[PDB]
């Protein structure tokens, strides 16, 4: 899982 | 639809990544947060939802030197506290 | 829907982290723009601009640069660039 | 607009 997806689940 | 108005250390980060304006969404500010933090290399190369920010603007935002993406309450805790609702 | 990059843009995602050959297609929007952000190739002002000169990206587009508005040039060069499995 | 959400909008 990238950082990009686990910031996407607080935007 | 809620306008926030970030307070000026958390307005420093967001200006530090192109941000040009003092009003901004929740939504936006957390694209913006999430920029930041890829920009300036802070998430963990292996275990990509840990984020180190020791020597950073961000660890001082925090009050923490590192934390975890997955800790929503704690993110929503620190923006909502920097940030001014209109 | 699984995908499996080709190699230039396989080299381009493990560049930020990723460990498999094969994706979803969200997985693989999802580091490219990781990668996007992390190689600081949008323009400051008009952050919808990619630079792409000398970087692995220009290869893949083909081009120095691209609109992120442009979304069906997007998906032309992801498709380009990966085998639907 | 930032990046990230010009980006959001093909992830």
Chains 1, 4 share one sequence.
Not at chain 2, 25 to 52: A, C, N, P, S
Request: aromatic share 14%; net charge positive; hydrophobic share 40%.
């Amino acid at each position: 899982t990238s950082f990009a997806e686990y910031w996407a689940x607080x935007p | 639809e809620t306008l926030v108005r970030p307070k000026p250390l958390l307005l420093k980060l967001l200006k530090s990544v192109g941000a040009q304006k003092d009003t901004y969404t929740m939504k936006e500010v957390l694209f913006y947060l999430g920029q930041y933090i890829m920009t300036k290399r802070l998430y963990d190369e292996k275990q990509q939802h840990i984020v180190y920010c020791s020597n950073d603007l961000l660890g001082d935002l925090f009050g923490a030197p590192s934390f975890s993406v997955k800790e929503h309450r704690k993110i929503y805790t620190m923006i909502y506290r920097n940030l001014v609702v209109v």
